[PDB]
Amino acid sequence: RALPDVRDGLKPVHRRILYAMNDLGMTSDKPYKKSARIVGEVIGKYHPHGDSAVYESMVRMAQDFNYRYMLVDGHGNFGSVDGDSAAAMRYTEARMSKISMEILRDITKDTIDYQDNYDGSEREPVVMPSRFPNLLVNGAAGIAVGMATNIPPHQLGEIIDGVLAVSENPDITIPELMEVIPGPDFPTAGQILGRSGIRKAYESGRGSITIRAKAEIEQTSSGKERIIVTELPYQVNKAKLIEKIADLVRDKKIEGITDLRDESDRTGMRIVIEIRRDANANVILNNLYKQTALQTSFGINLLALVDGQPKVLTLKQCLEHYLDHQKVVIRRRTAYELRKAEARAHILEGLRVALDHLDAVISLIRNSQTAEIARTGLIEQFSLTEKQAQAILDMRLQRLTGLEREKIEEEYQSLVKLIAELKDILANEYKVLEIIREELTEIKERFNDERRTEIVT
Amino acid sequence: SRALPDVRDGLKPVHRRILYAMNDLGMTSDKPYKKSARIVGEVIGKYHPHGDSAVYESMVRMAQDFNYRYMLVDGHGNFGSVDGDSAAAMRYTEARMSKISMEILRDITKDTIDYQDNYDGSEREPVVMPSRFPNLLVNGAAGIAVGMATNIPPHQLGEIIDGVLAVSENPDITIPELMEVIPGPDFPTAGQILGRSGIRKAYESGRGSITIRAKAEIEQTSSGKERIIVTELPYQVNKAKLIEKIADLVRDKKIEGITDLRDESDRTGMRIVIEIRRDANANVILNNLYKQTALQTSFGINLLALVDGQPKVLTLKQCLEHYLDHQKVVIRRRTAYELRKAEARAHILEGLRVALDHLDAVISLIRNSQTAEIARTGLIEQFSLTEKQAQAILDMRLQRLTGLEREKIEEEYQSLVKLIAELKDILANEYKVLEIIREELTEIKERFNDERRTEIVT
Ligand SMILES: [K+]
Ligand SMILES: [K+]
C-alpha cells in the first residue's frame, strides 16, 4: 500500500527487489551485476510498474545518506546528498549488502510463506525472515495521499537491545525502554533538539521533533571567526541549502556573512561560512538555524501494515510484533532442522547396519551385476530404505578405517542428542526466546557501529 | 618483438597475440561475436602494450576479405572495403575467430607449443602457434623490421597443402617439380599475373619481381562502339584512387580517346566501365592504361621470415620444409602428451584391478587399519602399489564393486593398453607421424578449399 510490513519493514517493491537479487545470485560474496538485470527481472516477475519506480527504489536502498544501514551494495554513481540523481541502470552495478544477507537468512529453511505473483506464473515471499529488526532500524519515509508513514532510522545496536529488553520483560514501560533506545539516529548525523518530541512519538505513535545540523565555530589567532557545518538535518539538500543561505545574504536578510564556500569532499562534509571580524558569529549561526533548513522539523508517524491493515503503533508495539515474527521464524526453522537432522540420522543408522554386517554386505554387492540389483538386494536382506541402500553404495572405501567408523558413531549419537534437543526447542517457548537472543547478539556484534546523531537535552 | 612472421605459423607477434587472446577468452568460431573493445583490451593489458590503434587495426586487417586470402577473424559491423574506407571505431564492432583459425589453434592445449613470459612477467603467451595449416604461405606477409622488409604474397590453400605433402613424400623435390603443384601466387583480389618467369625467379631465389594486372576486356556495342570493362584489379590497389587517377590522366589529356567513366560495381561485384570513341582502338588505349596507371603494377616478392628468431631469406622449398618440420614436431609433442595422459590413467586402473582382484584381503586390511594414512602404507607395502594407486583404491565408492562396474574398468583398461601401444608406435616410427600430417592436412583441404582466383597468363 506503500506502507511497510511491521515484521520485515519493507514496502512491496523493496521486498521484491531483494528477493530477486537473492534469486539471481546477486549476494554479498558474489560479484556485482548490472542494475538493468535486477530491475527487468523484478518488473517482469514480481512488480510490474516500470524502470522508473523500480530502479529508483533499488537505488534508494544503496544510498548511505538515505539508509542508516544500506541494504543494496552499489558500485558506480548512485547519486548524492547534493541532489544529483543516479546514473542510468545500464551504467550501474548492484548486489546485496552484507547486512541484508541477514534480512534473507533462513528463507530456504521454510520460515516464510510464498504467494503467487501478479500473473500467477512465479512465486514471491509475503514476508522475509528478517533476522535483524529492519523497520525500526532503517525506517519508512513513504508519504502517500490516504496514509503517509514517516518512521525515522535508529542505531541498530539500540533497537536490538530494546527487542531483547522486551523479550526478558514483556511488561516494560515506554520510558524504561527509552533508556535503551534514547531516540532516532540519522544516516546523516545531526543533533536532535528535544527529548520531549521523541517521548511523545514513542508513547503515542505520532509526534514531532527538531533535527539540527552540526556547526562549530573555528576562530583564527586574530579572532576572526568562521562557521563550519559538517552535518545537516536528515534529507536536506546540501546544494539547495547553500543556494538558500547565499540567497538570504544577497537579499540582505542576514547581515554579517562575507563568503559562503562549500569545501566538502571525500574526507567528509565541510560547508564554510565567513563572518566579518566585527559580528557575533553565534547570533548569525542562530538566525541561520531559524531561517534556513540548517535546522528543520521532522514529523514522526509510526504507521505500518499489521496483518494487511494500516495501523499506527507505539514503540513497544513495533518491538513486540517484530519479536512475534522472530518466534514464528525460529520455531519453523527449527521444524526444518528437525526434519533435516532426523533424515541424516536415518542414513547414519543405515551406514551402521552396513558397517556391522560389512562382510555380508560386501559379498552381496560384488555378487550383484547391477547397482539396482544390489540395492533391492540390500533392501531385502537388511531391512533398509532405498535411501539407506544408495547411501551404502556411495560410501568410499576409506570410510572403513577405524577412526572413520568411530567418526560415524560419534556423528550419529551427536545427531540423536540434536533431534531430541530440537524437539524440546519446539515444545518450550523459553528455548526459542533464547535462540533469538543468541542470534540477535551475534548480529549486533557483527554489524554494530557507533551512534551518529547526538540527542541534546 | 620483431615485426616479421615466424616461418612456422606466419604471424607477426601482434597477430599471434590477438589470436591467442581471443581463443583464451572463448571468442571462438561457434560462440557469439564479442565487442571488439574487449578483445583489444585484453591484448593491450596482457600481451602487446602498444596502443589500441596498432592492435585494433591489426585485428581489422585479419578480417578483411580483400587483404587476407583466408580471413582469420570473423568480424561484424563495418570492417571497411577495398574503396579505402577504414573500419569504424572499436566501440562499434564485434568480432570472433573465423572457422579457419580454429585450425591455427588446434592442439595448443596439448603441450605442442612452448610458452614464454609476457612484457611484465605476469602472464604467459605462446611463442608460436601449432598452426595446423601452412599460414605463412597461404595468407602472405608484409612489413618492415630491423631494416629488412618482407613481402610474401597469398596462395591457394589447395596448392600449398598439395606441395607440403609433395615435400613430405619426396624430400628431394625440386623447385620446378614443385611448381607444377603451386603455379604461383593467388591474391584475394582476383586478376592477372603475367610472367611464369617472374614467379619462377621468386620461388627459386627468395627475391623476385612479379607483374600483376587488372582483368580488363574490350566489349562491343551494337553501334560498333567500344568499351573496356574492368572486373578485377591488382592486389592492394585502391579502386577509388584509380578512378581518380584515370580521371586526371584523361583530363590533363595525357591519354586520349576516352569518352565516359562509370563505376558499376555493386553487390554483383566490380564492373568499371570506360567508353571509347570509334576513332580510337580500345586495345592500344588499354595498353597505354596498363602502362600509365595502376591497372598493371609491380609486386616485389621477398620470402623473408624468422628461422629460430633470425631473419632469413628462404626459397619456396625451404618454406615448405620448415613448415613440415614444425608440424612433425607438433604431432610428436602431442602424441607424447596423449601418451603421458594414457599411461597415467592406465596406472590408476592397474591399481583398481589389483584391488578388485584380491578384494577381501584389501577390505580387511583397510578395516584393520586405523587411519587412511595407515591403510595407504598398508596397501603400498602389501601389494606393491603407488601412493597414487593406493589413494585411488581408498577413494573407490562401493558400487564400483558391482559386476557391471568391474567390467567397465576392465574395458577402459583394455582400450587404454591398446592406446598406449598405438601411441608408442607413432612415436617410434616417423612414417606414421608423416601419415598423421597427410591425413589431417587433407581433411583440412577437404573442408576449407576454394577455387583459384588469380589466373596465371603466359
Ligand atoms: K527553520
Ligand atoms: K604501371
List all residues 6 or more positions away from A48 whose beta carbon is below 8 Å from its beta carbon. Answer: A118
| Site of grid cell 542470534 | A439
Distance A296 CA to ligand 1 centre (A): 5
The beta strands (E) that lie in A126-205 are given as 191-192
3-class DSSP assignment, residue A312: strand
| Site of grid cell 544529483 | A84
Quick one: A165 and A28 in the same domain? yes
B261 interfaces chain A, CB cutoff of 8 Å: no
Q: Do the beta carbons of residue B394 and residue B375 sit within 8 Å? A: yes
Torsion of CA A4, A8, A9, A10, to 10 degrees: -60
User: How far is Cα B24 from Cα A125, in angstroms, rounded to an integer?
Assistant: 42
CATH of the domain at B265: 3.30.1360.40
Q: Which of B258, B155, B158, B236 is nearest to B202 (CA)?
A: B155
User: How far is Cα A235 from Cα A71, in angstroms, rounded to an integer?
Assistant: 18
User: How far is Cα A295 from Cα B335, in angstroms, rounded to an integer?
Assistant: 81
Name residue A457's amino acid: T
Distance A98 CA to ligand 2 centre (A): 73
Q: Do the beta carbons of residue B261 and residue B246 sit within 8 Å? A: yes
Strand bridging mode B94-97 / B73-76: antiparallel
Quick one: B239 and B329 in the same domain? no
Q: Which of A381, A347, A348, A349 is nearest to A364 (CA)?
A: A381
Query: What φ, ψ does residue A446 adopt, rounded to 5°?
Result: -90, -40
Angle formed by the axes of helices B359-367 and B316-357, to 10°? 80
Which ranges in B47-113 belong to alpha helices (H)?
A: 51-61, 101-105
Quick one: A210 and A330 in the same domain? no
CATH of the domain at A186: 3.90.199.10
- Collect all residues of chain A within an 8 Å Cβ-Cβ radius of residue B395: 396-398
Quick one: A95 and A240 in the same domain? no
3-class DSSP assignment, residue B67: coil
B395–A396 CB contact, under 8 Å: yes
Strand bridging mode B115-117 / B272-276: unpaired
Quick one: B265 and B382 in the same domain? no
DSSP code string of B134-149: -HHHHH-EEEEETTEE
Cell of B62: 585479419
Q: Do the beta carbons of residue B96 and residue B31 sit within 8 Å? A: yes
Apex CA B161: angle with CA B158 and CA B164, to 5°? 150
Structure method: X-ray
Window 380-399 of A, Cβ < 8 Å to B: 392-398
CATH of the domain at B370: 1.10.268.10
Q: Do the beta carbons of residue A184 and residue A154 sit within 8 Å? A: yes
List all residues 6 or more positions away from B164 whose beta carbon is below 8 Å from its beta carbon. Answer: B134, B320, B323, B324, B441
Residue A398's Cβ-side half-sphere holds a number of Cα atoms within 13 Å equal to 15
DSSP code string of A31-70: PPEEHHHHHHHHHHHT--S-HHHHHHHHHHTT-TTT-SS-
Apex CA B20: angle with CA B35 and CA B1, to 5°? 110
Cell of B453: 582466383
Distances (CA, A) of A89 to A40, A93, B413: 10, 8, 56
User: How far is Cα B135 from Cα B154, in angstroms, rounded to an integer?
Assistant: 9
DSSP code string of B207-256: EEEEEEE-EEEEEE-TTS-EEEEEEE--TT--HHHHHHHHHHHHHTTSS-
A417 interfaces chain B, CB cutoff of 8 Å: no
A401–B371 CB contact, under 8 Å: yes
Find residue B210's DSSP bridge partners: B299
Which ranges in A193-314 belong to alpha helices (H)?
A: 195-204, 238-251, 281-291
A365–B396 CB contact, under 8 Å: no
- Collect all residues of chain B within an 8 Å Cβ-Cβ radius of residue A401: 366-367, 369-372, 374-375
Torsion sign over Cα B73, B74, B75, B81 = positive
Determine the distance in angstroms separating the CA of A251 from the nearest CA of chain B, rounded to an integer.
Answer: 51
Q: SS in 3 state form for B27-59? A: CCCCCCCEEHHHHHHHHHHHCCCCHHHHHHHHH
Query: What φ, ψ does residue A218 adopt, rounded to 5°?
Result: -75, 145
Distance A292 CA to ligand 1 centre (A): 5
User: Is residue A337 within a helix (H) or strand (E), and if so which, with residue range?
Assistant: helix A315-356
* Cα radius of gyration rounded to whole Å, chain A: 29
Determine the distance in angstroms separating the CA of A373 from the nearest CA of chain B, rounded to an integer.
Answer: 9
Provide the domain limits for residue B423: 339-428
Query: What φ, ψ does residue B95 adopt, rounded to 5°?
Result: -160, 170
Specify the length of chain A in residues: 457
User: How far is Cα B119 from Cα A367, in angstroms, rounded to an integer?
Assistant: 62
Q: How many helices (H) and strands (E) does chain B have?
A: 16, 17
Q: Do the beta carbons of residue B212 and residue B191 sit within 8 Å? A: yes
The 8-class DSSP code of residue A4 comes to: P
Specify the length of chain B in residues: 458
Quick one: A169 and A63 in the same domain? yes
Query: What φ, ψ does residue B295 adopt, rounded to 5°?
Result: -70, -15
Strand bridging mode A191-192 / A454-455: parallel
Number of domain units in chain B: 3
How many other CB atoms are there within 10 angstroms of residue B320's CB atom?
A: 24
- Collect all residues of chain A within an 8 Å Cβ-Cβ radius of residue B369: 401-402
Quick one: A84 and A233 in the same domain? no
Of A277, A301, A325, which marks where a domain is finished?
A: A301
Strand bridging mode B296-302 / B272-276: unpaired
Find residue A206's DSSP bridge partners: A301
A397–B394 CB contact, under 8 Å: yes
Q: Do the beta carbons of residue B132 and residue B440 sit within 8 Å? A: yes
User: How far is Cα B311 from Cα B147, in angstroms, rounded to an integer?
Assistant: 10
Name residue A229's amino acid: V
Torsion of CA A100, A106, A110, A114, to 10 degrees: 10
Distances (CA, A) of A381 to A364, A395, B402, B404: 9, 18, 17, 21
Q: Do the beta carbons of residue B327 and residue B387 sit within 8 Å? A: no
Apex CA B240: angle with CA B237 and CA B244, to 5°? 105
User: Is residue A403 within a helix (H) or strand (E), and if so which, with residue range?
Assistant: helix A402-427
Cell of B238: 585502391
Quick one: A267 and A379 in the same domain? no
Quick one: A106 and A255 in the same domain? no
Distances (CA, A) of B233 to A252, A412, B196, B243, B454: 81, 85, 19, 12, 10
Q: Do the beta carbons of residue B164 and residue B324 sit within 8 Å? A: yes
Q: Which residue of A has its CA nearest to B378?
A: A401
Annotation marks residue A91 as catalytic? yes
Full strand arrangement of the beta sheet holding B148-152: B141-145, B148-152, B296-302, B207-213, B191-193, B454-456
User: How far is Cα A310 from Cα B91, in angstroms, rounded to an integer?
Assistant: 52
Cell of B177: 617439380
Quick one: B198 and B321 in the same domain? yes
Apex CA B457: angle with CA B453 and CA B458, to 5°? 155
Q: Which of B91, B98, B65, B67 is nearest to B77 (CA)?
A: B91
Q: Which of B140, B73, B126, B65 is nearest to B100 (CA)?
A: B73
B398–A398 CB contact, under 8 Å: no
Torsion sign over Cα A63, A67, A68, A70 = negative
A397–B402 CB contact, under 8 Å: no
| Site of grid cell 600449398 | B160
The beta strands (E) that lie in A366-409 are given as none
* Widest Cα–Cα separation across chain A: 105
User: How far is Cα A198 from Cα A300, in angstroms, rounded to an integer?
Assistant: 8
How many other CB atoms are there within 10 angstroms of residue B74's CB atom?
A: 19
3-class DSSP assignment, residue B197: helix
Distances (CA, A) of B426 to B50, B197, B287, B415, B436: 43, 42, 58, 17, 9
**Residue burial B27-50, b: 16+ Cβ < 10 Å; e: rest:** bbeeeeebbbbbbbbbbbebbbee
Choose, out of B373, B376, B402, B407, the residue to mutate when testing the contact with A (most A CBs < 10 Å). Answer: B402
Burial class (CB in 10 A: 0-12, 13-18, 19+), A380: exposed
Strand bridging mode B94-97 / B258-263: unpaired
How many other CB atoms are there within 10 angstroms of residue B457's CB atom?
A: 12
Which ranges in B72-128 belong to alpha helices (H)?
A: 101-105
* Widest Cα–Cα separation across chain B: 112
Q: Do the beta carbons of residue A296 and residue A233 sit within 8 Å? A: yes
3-class DSSP assignment, residue A143: coil
For residue A108, the Cα-to-chain-centroid distance in whole angstroms is 17
3-class DSSP assignment, residue A245: helix
Distances (CA, A) of A395 to A364, A375, A380, B365: 15, 13, 19, 17
Quick one: B422 and B349 in the same domain? yes
B361 interfaces chain A, CB cutoff of 8 Å: no
Find residue B299's DSSP bridge partners: B210
Distances (CA, A) of A283 to A422, B377, B420: 65, 88, 95
User: How far is Cα B74 from Cα B94, in angstroms, rounded to an integer?
Assistant: 9
The 8-class DSSP code of residue A29 comes to: S
**Residue burial A159-189, b: 16+ Cβ < 10 Å; e: rest:** bbbbbbbbbeeeebeeeebbebbbbbbbbbb
Burial class (CB in 10 A: 0-12, 13-18, 19+), B126: buried
| Documented resolution in Å | 3.3
Quick one: A9 and A155 in the same domain? yes
User: How far is Cα A411 from Cα B220, in angstroms, rounded to an integer?
Assistant: 99
Distance A238 CA to ligand 1 centre (A): 15
List all residues 6 or more positions away from B435 whose beta carbon is below 8 Å from its beta carbon. Answer: none
Cell of B387: 601412493
Q: Do the beta carbons of residue B394 and residue A397 sit within 8 Å? A: yes
End-to-end C-alpha distance for chain A, whole angstroms: 37
Q: Do the beta carbons of residue A111 and residue A128 sit within 8 Å? A: no
Distances (CA, A) of B31 to A275, B27, B64, B224: 68, 6, 20, 57
